[PDB]
């Protein structure tokens, strides 16, 4: 009862920060902004795949089921990261330490509506005082609960959901006795995460189809996955 | 402890069944199918607005906040209804007793992908053995948790969420002692409901823009709401 092992484990499994490194030789444009974001996402995806192996039971799934979960959840994981990094900021999104977007920049990149939705997620989590413990557990839950149409072992995936849900419940029962409904409140933030992710995916799929922004192999693979 | 009053209340507040009444004089087409569905939805929307007043604290919200919740949640409520009606069927959606769509009909109407997503929701709820008690409580939660950008009294809306979340938790603690994580499992079905609803809204917005399917006042009002 010092607190949940799965939560502790997810905390130590947390990947190091990644830099966006916008090209200082390129003039600022919508194409620059979007090229930078997609490049950053491609590198994050590598780290996410590595991170997932630390989740209890994930590496025991078939490679196919592992990839199905990742192909469904990837954008929710990416978004939750930016959301968390942005918690101590106001009306700004911390994509990286060297890449913090305010309203004007979002307009320039054509991302005003998308970044406003992400800011809505930030707003909700701020008022809830989302902790790192909660963030890492929610990223794991979003992976397990990602609703892929293509799952082979449905029951094993449901088991993984249950293991991580239990970790959230246990953590909340021990750490937040003042609110016995905090775990459920955390789970009730997942629909807006799903909604914002669905919008981000279609948006960047549209950018992919327009052909003006170069994208790397892994990002494209994730983007080109079937719903 | 016979069981939760809010749940009992929602049960008696449950609206009577509505008929689709496809026009028997009109030849079957995609336009007929979609005209019928949108007409049915328009009449359901009237009943949903009436139903919401029975939810504790809802009518105490300002008219603006009431309408914001409804304009964000309406499609999730409509979808959850079809999902529930379809639970004892296989690969068919019971839009109404006189309007049950199989795969072929969905293809004809251009709804294959949408109806497959709704069937995924059905599949999950079947395996969970979703009860009417749970269905009615989830419709209410989806309304309160609908994530409108336009809320005036955020704290009152959060209170409504909490009241209905508490009802779900209490019901599950009393009725399903074999699974102390069933309430959370119910909440973890809301992201796919949100996802499917977002897709249904854009789809029918596209149909609205094409101008070939006539739609009524209230349905259009709900469709024309800002995200
Ligand atoms: C490019 C992408 C997918 C993005 C950018 C803007 C809005 C939504 C997603 C992104 C990139 C990096 C990241 O950490 C999170 C998301
Ligand atoms: C027309 C609409 C919004 C619909 C139809 C097909 C797929 C998704 C939504 C609908 C209509 C009636 C209904 O009970 C639930 C949904």
UniProtKB/Swiss-Prot annotation, chains A, B:
Entry function: Orphan receptor that acts as a transcription activator in the absence of bound ligand. Binds specifically to an estrogen response element and activates reporter genes controlled by estrogen response elements. Induces the expression of PERM1 in the skeletal muscle.
Tissue specificity note: Expressed in the heart, kidney, brain, lung, bone marrow, adrenal gland, trachea, spinal cord and thyroid gland.
Oligomer and partners: Homodimer. Binds TLE1, PNRC1 and PNRC2. Binds GRIP1. Interacts with NRIP1, NCOA1 and NCOR2.
Post-translational modification: Acetylated by PCAF/KAT2 (in vitro).
Miscellaneous: No physiological activating ligand is known for this orphan receptor, but 4-hydroxytamoxifen and diethylstilbestrol act as inverse agonists and deactivate ESRRG.
Name of the protein in question: Estrogen-related receptor gamma
Natural source organism: Homo sapiens
Family under the similarity heading: Belongs to the nuclear hormone receptor family. NR3 subfamily.
Segments forming domain NR LBD: 2-226
Signal sequence range: none
Gene: ESRRG
Locations listed in the record: Nucleus
């Amino acid at each position: 009862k010092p607190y949940n092992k799965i939560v502790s484990h997810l905390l130590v499994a947390e990947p190091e920060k990644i830099y966006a490194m916008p090209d200082p030789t390129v003039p600022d444009s919508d194409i620059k902004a979007l090229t930078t974001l997609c490049d950053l996402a491609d590198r994050e995806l590598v780290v996410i795949i590595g991170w997932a192996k630390h989740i209890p039971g994930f590496s025991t799934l078939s490679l196919a089921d592992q990839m199905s979960l990742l192909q469904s959840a990837w954008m929710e994981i990416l978004i939750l990261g930016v959301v968390y990094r942005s918690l101590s900021f106001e009306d700004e999104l911390v994509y990286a330490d060297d890449y913090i977007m305010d309203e004007d920049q979002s307009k320039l990149a054509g991302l005003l509506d998308l970044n406003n939705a992400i800011l809505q997620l930030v707003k909700k989590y701020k008022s809830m005082k989302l902790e790192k413990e909660e963030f890492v557990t929610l990223k794991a839950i979003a992976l397990a609960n990602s609703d892929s149409m293509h799952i082979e072992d449905v029951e094993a995936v449901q088991k993984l959901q249950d293991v991580l849900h239990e970790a959230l419940q246990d953590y909340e029962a021990g750490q937040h006795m003042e609110d016995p409904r905090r775990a459920g409140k955390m789970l009730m933030t997942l629909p807006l995460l799903r909604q914002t992710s669905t919008k981000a995916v279609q948006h960047f799929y549209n950018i992919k189809l327009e052909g003006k922004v170069p994208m790397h192999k892994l990002f494209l693979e994730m983007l080109e996955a079937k719903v």
